[PDB]
Amino acid sequence: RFLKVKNWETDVVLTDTLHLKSTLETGCTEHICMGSIMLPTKDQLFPLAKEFLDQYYSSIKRFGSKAHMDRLEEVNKEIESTSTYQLKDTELIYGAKHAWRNASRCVGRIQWSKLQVFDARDCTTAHGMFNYICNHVKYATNKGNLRSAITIFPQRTDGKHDFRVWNSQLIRYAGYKQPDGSTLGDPANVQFTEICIQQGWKAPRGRFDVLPLLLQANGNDPELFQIPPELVLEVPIRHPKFDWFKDLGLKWYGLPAVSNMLLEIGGLEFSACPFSGWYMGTEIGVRDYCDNSRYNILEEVAKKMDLDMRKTSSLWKDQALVEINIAVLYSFQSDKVTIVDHHSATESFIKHMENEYRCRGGCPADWVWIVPPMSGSITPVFHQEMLNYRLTPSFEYQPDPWNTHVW
Amino acid sequence: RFLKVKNWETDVVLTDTLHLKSTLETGCTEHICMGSIMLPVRTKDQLFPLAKEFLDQYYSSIKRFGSKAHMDRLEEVNKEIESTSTYQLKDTELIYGAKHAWRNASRCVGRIQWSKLQVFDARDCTTAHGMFNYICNHVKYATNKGNLRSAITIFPQRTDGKHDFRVWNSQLIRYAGYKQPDGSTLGDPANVQFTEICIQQGWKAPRGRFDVLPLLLQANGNDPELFQIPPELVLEVPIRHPKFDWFKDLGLKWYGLPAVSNMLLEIGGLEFSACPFSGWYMGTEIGVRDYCDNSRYNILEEVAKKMDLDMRKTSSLWKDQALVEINIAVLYSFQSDKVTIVDHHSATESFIKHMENEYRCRGGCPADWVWIVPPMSGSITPVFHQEMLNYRLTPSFEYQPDPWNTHVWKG
Numbered sequence: 001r002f003l004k005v006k007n008w009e010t011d012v013v014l015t016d017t018l019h020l021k022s023t024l025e026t027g028c029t030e031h032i033c034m035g036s037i038m039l040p041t042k043d044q045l046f047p048l049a050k051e052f053l054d055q056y057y058s059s060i061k062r063f064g065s066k067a068h069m070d071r072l073e074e075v076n077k078e079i080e081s082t083s084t085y086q087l088k089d090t091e092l093i094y095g096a097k098h099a100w101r102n103a104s105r106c107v108g109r110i111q112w113s114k115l116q117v118f119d120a121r122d123c124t125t126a127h128g129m130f131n132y133i134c135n136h137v138k139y140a141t142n143k144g145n146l147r148s149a150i151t152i153f154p155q156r157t158d159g160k161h162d163f164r165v166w167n168s169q170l171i172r173y174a175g176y177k178q179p180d181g182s183t184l185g186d187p188a189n190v191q192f193t194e195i196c197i198q199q200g201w202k203a204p205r206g207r208f209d210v211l212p213l214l215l216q217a218n219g220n221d222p223e224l225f226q227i228p229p230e231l232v233l234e235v236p237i238r239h240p241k242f243d244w245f246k247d248l249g250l251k252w253y254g255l256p257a258v259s260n261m262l263l264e265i266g267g268l269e270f271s272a273c274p275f276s277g278w279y280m281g282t283e284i285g286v287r288d289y290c291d292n293s294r295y296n297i298l299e300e301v302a303k304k305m306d307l308d309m310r311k312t313s314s315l316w317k318d319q320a321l322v323e324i325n326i327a328v329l330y331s332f333q334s335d336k337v338t339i340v341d342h343h344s345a346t347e348s349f350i351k352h353m354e355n356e357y358r359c360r361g362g363c364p365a366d367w368v369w370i371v372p373p374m375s376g377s378i379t380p381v382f383h384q385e386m387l388n389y390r391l392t393p394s395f396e397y398q399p400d401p402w403n404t405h406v407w
Numbered sequence: 408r409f410l411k412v413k414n415w416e417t418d419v420v421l422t423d424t425l426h427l428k429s430t431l432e433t434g435c436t437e438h439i440c441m442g443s444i445m446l447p448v449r450t451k452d453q454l455f456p457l458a459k460e461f462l463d464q465y466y467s468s469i470k471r472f473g474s475k476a477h478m479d480r481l482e483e484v485n486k487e488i489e490s491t492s493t494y495q496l497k498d499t500e501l502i503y504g505a506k507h508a509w510r511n512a513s514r515c516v517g518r519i520q521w522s523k524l525q526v527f528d529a530r531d532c533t534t535a536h537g538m539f540n541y542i543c544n545h546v547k548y549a550t551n552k553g554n555l556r557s558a559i560t561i562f563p564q565r566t567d568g569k570h571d572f573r574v575w576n577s578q579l580i581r582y583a584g585y586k587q588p589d590g591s592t593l594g595d596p597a598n599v600q601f602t603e604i605c606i607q608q609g610w611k612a613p614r615g616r617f618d619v620l621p622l623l624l625q626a627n628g629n630d631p632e633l634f635q636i637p638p639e640l641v642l643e644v645p646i647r648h649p650k651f652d653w654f655k656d657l658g659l660k661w662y663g664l665p666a667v668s669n670m671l672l673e674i675g676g677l678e679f680s681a682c683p684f685s686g687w688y689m690g691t692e693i694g695v696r697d698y699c700d701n702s703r704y705n706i707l708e709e710v711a712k713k714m715d716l717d718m719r720k721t722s723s724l725w726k727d728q729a730l731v732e733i734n735i736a737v738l739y740s741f742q743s744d745k746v747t748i749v750d751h752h753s754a755t756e757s758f759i760k761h762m763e764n765e766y767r768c769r770g771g772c773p774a775d776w777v778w779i780v781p782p783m784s785g786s787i788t789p790v791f792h793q794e795m796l797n798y799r800l801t802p803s804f805e806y807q808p809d810p811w812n813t814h815v816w817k818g
């Protein structure tokens with residue numbers, strides 16, 4: 001019931017009790033581990049509400065005060081009456097910060113408590129949503145000195161009036177299937193790019209076309225909006241040693257901003273809650289650039305490097321992978337756009353786990369996601385045992401809206 | 408119940424039914440996943456079901472399930488259990504058992520090779536000198552002058568738990584580690600405690616950076632005894648780099664034969680506490696882990712110094728750069744001296760093919776993603792993108808406590 005995790009590099013042992021609070025389920029059983037699987041009413045809502053308010057009031061040293069009991073009373077009456085309830089601002093901010101704090105897949109959580117929360121619960125239309133989103137983009141970008149932020153749209157009611165951003169991230173590049181048979185741009189986005197075109201978007205049909213936003217307010221049909229280009233900070237990718245690197249025509253955007261997740265606070269569901277921080281270098285250079293199903297650029301880069309591509313054992317892929325990642329970091333740094341390398345990010349996360357173990361009794365962490373997709377064992381997280389479990393408030397996956405929406 | 412895994416690079420979806428045959432527990436529950444935890448005296452009582460389940464698997468594998476040979480074997484094992492409290496495996500069952508323990512090892516990326524395993528039956532062994540002789544033969548057979556062949560040697564099984572056969576070494580071939588008075592370490596820091604045990608048992612340490620450890624062998628629950636593997640049997644590879652001529656001057660070498668000697672092999676409820684097995688290296692095991700772990704030889708700094716990379720900021724990726732160079736060197740050296748090795752691209756690609764084949768013919772392949780994904784360049788190997796299901800089948804290889812922790816000294 002008290003659980004130990006060990007770091008095998010430093011022998012530091014932490015004891016986890018926080019897991020006992022865990023409410024939701026992992027996918028695993030005693031007979032099978034699902035650790036590497038990507039995705040494993042009035043009566044329901046009041047316990048969820050209570051458990052939330054309990055931790056909130058405990059967090060401000062007012063557990064079992066009249067302020068606590070009164071709020072529990074007030075939310076209880078409101079659920080009884082309206083079948084839902086409204087969060088105070090203070091609760092909303094707390095709930096959102098803790099959803100990040102509880103995100104077991106997130107290596108960047110040392111920053112969890114510095115999150116700007118934009119309350120957009122008063123929003124009613126897609127134009128409104130566009131406005132809120134542009135303000136978020138500009139605030140978070142901050143001319144390259146990025147700041148973490150979340151914007152929170154109205155909460156699900158009867159589920160026929162959902163707010164949704166259809167984009168997977170606020171800023172992403174278009175993907176186009178060609179006569180060729182090959183793919184121009186980002187193949188991850190082929191489908192969404194066709195939904196946009198099917199909606200009216202004037203596709204430039206280039207390699208790096210910023211997607212339009214497709215915003216759904218109140219369960220209505222989503223509408224297209226172009227983000228003002230002046231608000232989309234992009235970085236040309238060059239190498240501090242290879243002159244020819246720039247000839248590849250690579251660029252990426254500065255602001256990673258997830259928009260397809262569902263934020264759950266005290267039983268309430270926020271289906272539109274775009275959030276943003278900044279990139280770890282490997283996200284772009286390893287995954288965006290080198291995944292076979294992504295821009296998949298390793299062959300061209302190795303070619304330009306004149307490596308022996310005959311045998312896998314020359315480690316030409318590995319050589320090219322490193323150079324590509326050196327260049328991503330160098331470019332962002334040169335242009336003063338916030339980025340973190342995998343060494344610094346993972347070091348910070350170890351320090352964050354130590355803080356959490358001490359202050360909170362644990363830190364849910366998903367090793368499969370936390371370990372960077374290159375140089376795993378030369379980062380300290382590789383050698384760190386982690387316990388994974390689900391705490392609320394949380395960010396959750398939800399199905400892509402086009403499968404759901406009724407046109 | 409049927410369970411699906413998806414490869415996210417290829418969209419290939421596989422369906423697992425094999426997981427239904429799993430008995431042992433994982434460590435996980437519906438409320439916690441323990442997938443990254445490194446580690447999450449039998450009665451007649453528990454023994455006959457374990458024997459029966461094993462013999463049913465064995466007789467099904469040879470397409471003789473329910474035959475008279477099958478039934479007579481069950482009866483004969485049953486009788487032997489109640490009469491002697493244990494039972495002996497036939498040679499064929501032992502072979503089948505050892506191969507399947509490898510087939511079932513969810514953390515092993517090399518399982519495409521599981522059915523090519525030379526099994527040496529050492530159950531007639533009685534003394535530590537006997538064990539040394541068995542182990543020398545295994546090393547010479549497996550080494551095969553560079554052209555490595557997989558093998559396991561299997562000493563007598565546990566009886567009362569007070570007469571265990573054990574190899575004290577963690578690997579048959581491993582380098583010594585020495586803690587210096589100034590607190591630095593000479594040789595391999597991982598083997599310090601074991602090296603100290605050897606010295607105290609009477610080993611004369613050469614005290615260099617790559618001293619091959621002596622074997623410390625325990626027969627029949629007796630105090631262990633020291634033996635030196637004949638040096639002519641220990642194939643080693645000097646490490647050099649194909650382009651960097653200063654690399655040789657780092658003075659690095661490694662041994663060619665990886666041979667795990669501290670695991671327990673469980674077959675039909677029987678426990679083989681000494682079962683050294685060997686195959687060959689994937690390059691990253693040496694170039695990433697043995698050379699570049701901070702707690703191991705830790706050569707990253709010295710390598711990047713010689714490469715004159717910018718070491719002033721981690722964001723130069725000087726570590727990542729030196730890491731690739733060291734791994735090229737390891738593969739280059741082995742291939743040049745014609746000593747079997749596999750790179751992590753080739754090994755992971757073969758594993759995916761093995762895995763698909765296993766789902767097809769067997770109904771599943773238990774796999775531990777934390778361990779299967781290589782410790783460098785994770786996502787440019789196909790396994791990173793492969794969903795996997797981890798569960799425990801028997802026969803199996805299991806961890807056991809270090810014997811210096813449990814042994815009753817005779818003196």
Ligand code: HEM
Pocket residue numbers: 099100103105106107108109111115148149150275276277278279280283340345369395
């Ligand atoms: C401030 C800098 C931040 C860094 C450097 C960072 C780093 C990361 C990285 C690298 C991932 C893995 C992404 C992938 O492989 O696709 C991730 C996952 C995640 N992070 Fe962050 N993070 C940051 C801030 C945030 C913020 C502000 C939130 C929300 C408030 C957040 C919530 C998450 C969630 C929910 C996941 C998992 C997504 C999923 O399961 O698909 N992080 N983090």
Ligand code: HEM
Pocket residue numbers: 505508509512514515516517518520524557558559684685686687688689692749754778804
């Ligand atoms: C034939 C060549 C083989 C290759 C290339 C290979 C590859 C590997 C590698 C790279 C590991 C991870 C080791 C580590 O990080 O410490 C491993 C684990 C393992 N393999 Fe193999 N393997 C091979 C043959 C075998 C054989 C012959 C057996 C036994 C019959 C075996 C059983 C295991 C077991 C039990 C583990 C997990 C060890 C643990 O949990 O600590 N493999 N395999």
Ligand SMILES: N=C(Nc1cccc(COC[C@@H]2C[C@H](OCc3cccc(NC(=N)c4cccs4)c3)CN2)c1)c1cccs1
Pocket residue numbers: 038039256257258275276277278279280283397398399400
């Ligand atoms: N530095 C960052 N990187 C970052 C952080 C978090 C997330 C991401 C973007 O990655 C998300 C992708 C998304 C991707 O998920 C794959 C996938 C494919 C198809 C469907 C679903 N899920 C579904 N909608 C469902 C179908 C059926 C039932 S549910 C997931 C993995 N991963 C980047 C930051 C972004 C925001 C703040 S920091």
Ligand SMILES: N=C(Nc1cccc(COC[C@@H]2C[C@H](OCc3cccc(NC(=N)c4cccs4)c3)CN2)c1)c1cccs1
Pocket residue numbers: 445446517665666667684685686687688689692806807808809
């Ligand atoms: N290519 C190969 N490499 C290979 C394959 C398997 C294993 C290894 C090397 O494994 C050694 C490292 C070391 C690591 O084990 C961690 C560890 C540390 C300390 C103790 C224990 N276990 C215990 N004795 C216990 C304490 C308390 C209860 S039990 C485990 C796993 N791993 C190499 C092959 C070897 C043989 C055939 S292929």
Ligand SMILES: C[C@H](O)[C@H](O)[C@H]1CNc2nc(N)[nH]c(=O)c2N1
Pocket residue numbers: 035036037038368369370415791792793794795
């Ligand atoms: C199948 C496997 O779970 C999948 O490839 C995961 C592995 N680890 C990951 N880790 C991160 N940070 N991001 C990812 O998208 C993935 N993908």
Ligand SMILES: C[C@H](O)[C@H](O)[C@H]1CNc2nc(N)[nH]c(=O)c2N1
Pocket residue numbers: 008382383384385386442443444445777778779
């Ligand atoms: C804590 C963590 O589970 C531990 O460091 C594991 C991770 N994956 C591994 N994978 C392999 N193949 N070998 C290892 O020693 C480890 N170490």
Ligand SMILES: [Zn+2]
Pocket residue numbers: 028032033034035435439440441442
């Ligand atoms: Zn699990």
